[PDB]
Design a protein. Structure first.
Ligand SMILES: [Zn+2]
Ligand SMILES: [Zn+2]
Lengths: 330, 330
């Protein structure tokens, strides 16, 4: 039999991300000899981006390709299924945690409880911030109306004095154009350029060379399927889909990075100034971030289990010291 | 029909690498519904490790899973299909170069001329060095009889004054034991421990925290199949094997990294001391390395094509400056 799944992505039509997503649907068809076809839908075509979770749960959408931390408000563990401020910051570290340190199994158990099947993470990129005004040091975040993807990312910036707001990436351009917000994080350079942020914001704010991305160094996406639909798919096809997603994870990653290399010269051409924060600004964010990591970990049994193993890993590779964990518990 | 392929790996029996490789053949069987069965063979079981290239070319072996730079002496481009001293040093950078910047197509074209189908790279790990006597700085390399995997890696150490020797990892232990060599690089901590290096060498030599691996930060493996055997495989199975290898690339990478985390405590227990070189030491190696990059790049049309796009990429991410390239050119 042939199966057809309808999957909407967080990528807006007309972005490098959507183009990569379109090709993935062709690859799935090739890998399953046409037995499984995925019909792609750009952000907002079936439902709003943040409404994808419920639509996939009901089966109205067969699956979704979101940025995983979008569900942080309803599933605490998802704040730990994508990068959070100053924690693990390399694609290979997240890949290791998910694929050998138990991360994938935590995600699958948590999503199964929601009637969803978490297939696996899709590698992507770090994120940058676009601002209408110069933010040159930690203290300049005070009073900035900043769009961020909620969750722990928003909490960290709020602890730095920013007024945070949650908006889908597609609403950032009009918000900055009208001055409804002063700044916005979204994704990396290439897609932000596709969305025109450079024309409504003259600055790009990044961390120092040592920590380019303070908040989201590894902004993971994923594929999540309605559990019933997943369980109805023949096992051989389920296994091929898992392989297709893991292969795509890196094909997506590479395509985004190539587009990013091409985008930087364009920002310079557009007259956009890239502001680099300092190592000291990062330390100020670090002191705010660690206690917040623990508060989020303490939300439910899944966030605790995921952070516990991530913390152990961070200790093993020198990303956290016992001294800085003083007074914190788990 | 059902296809059966014998594929030998550079991993010795009894290593974490070989266990991961055995699992991959089961994964291939599952992904192809039993149509493609790869019978795994540990290093030296069918042919010698360095004989795999000719064994596969002539068909004695259907395919191989080697460390790609083993063929540097016969195919100059392979010295650029795996990490080399002080160039790109993160797994994600090599993934990007191969999958979006044209790297994969260069490898495939170069191998096709040899009657081989290069499937894709297999991520792995950085490498560390084990020594019988301490090597605490750049100058301590003079006079050291050092085992390395030849090619550009051997040439950089020779430039530092070491007497290099080429040996399969499975022959490092006896070579150290009987004093044939003073030190040896091979792979990461877990597998080196599997091979018992800690029993014949009390030191591990690594770069500073900023540059843990000076010579081989991304020691890639790959799958290469006899071209005729590849062409006789139905296209649907060719595509599934390609996806399987790419998925495995990271499953392998993650498994190796987990094992590495578990190995450090065993080295401490075995009484092995980890010596870290300095940033100054890295600079001394750097001044030798860069000119060597160009020497190897100019070897043939493929080594030139590969290095050309890698240099362009490194320039793009600030890994090299025009200043330090003064007087060097393709
Ligand atoms: Zn973001
Ligand atoms: Zn090596």
């Amino acid at each position: 039999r042939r199966y057809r799944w309808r999957i909407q992505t967080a990528w807006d039509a007309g972005t490098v991300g959507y183009s990569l997503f379109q090709k993935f649907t062709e690859r799935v068809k090739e890998l399953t000899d046409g037995q499984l076809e995925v019909q792609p839908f750009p952000a907002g075509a079936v439902v709003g981006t943040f409404d994808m979770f419920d639509a996939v749960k009901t089966g109205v959408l067969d699956g979704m390709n979101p940025f995983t931390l979008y569900w942080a408000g309803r599933m605490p563990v998802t704040a730990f299924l994508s990068s959070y401020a100053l924690g693990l910051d390399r694609p290979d570290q997240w890949e290791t945690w998910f694929y050998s340190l138990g991360g994938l199994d935590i995600a699958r158990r948590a999503f199964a409880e929601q009637g969803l099947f978490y297939v696996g993470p899709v590698q992507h990129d770090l994120n940058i911030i676009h601002s209408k005004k110069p933010i040159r040091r930690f203290e300049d975040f005070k009073g900035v109306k900043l769009r961020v993807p909620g969750g722990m990312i928003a909490e960290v910036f709020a602890a730095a004095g920013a007024s945070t707001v949650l908006l889908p990436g597609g609403e950032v351009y009009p918000a900055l154009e009208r001055g409804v917000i002063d700044a916005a994080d979204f994704v990396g350079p290439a897609v932000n350029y596709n969305l025109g942020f450079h024309q409504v914001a003259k600055y790009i704010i990044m961390g120092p060379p040592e920590t380019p991305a303070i908040h989201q160094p590894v902004d993971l996406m994923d594929f999540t399927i309605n559990l019933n639909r997943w369980r109805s798919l023949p096992k051989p096809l389920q296994e091929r889909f898992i392989a297709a997603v893991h292969e795509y994870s890196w094909i997506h990653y590479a395509g985004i990075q190539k587009a990013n290399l091409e985008a930087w010269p364009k920002y310079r051409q557009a007259g956009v100034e890239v502001i680099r924060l300092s190592n000291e600004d990062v330390r100020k964010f670090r002191r705010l971030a660690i206690p917040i990591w623990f508060k989020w970990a303490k939300m439910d049994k899944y966030s605790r289990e995921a952070f516990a193993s991530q913390l152990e890993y961070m200790k093993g590779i020198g990303y956290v010291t016992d001294e800085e964990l003083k007074g914190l518990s788990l």
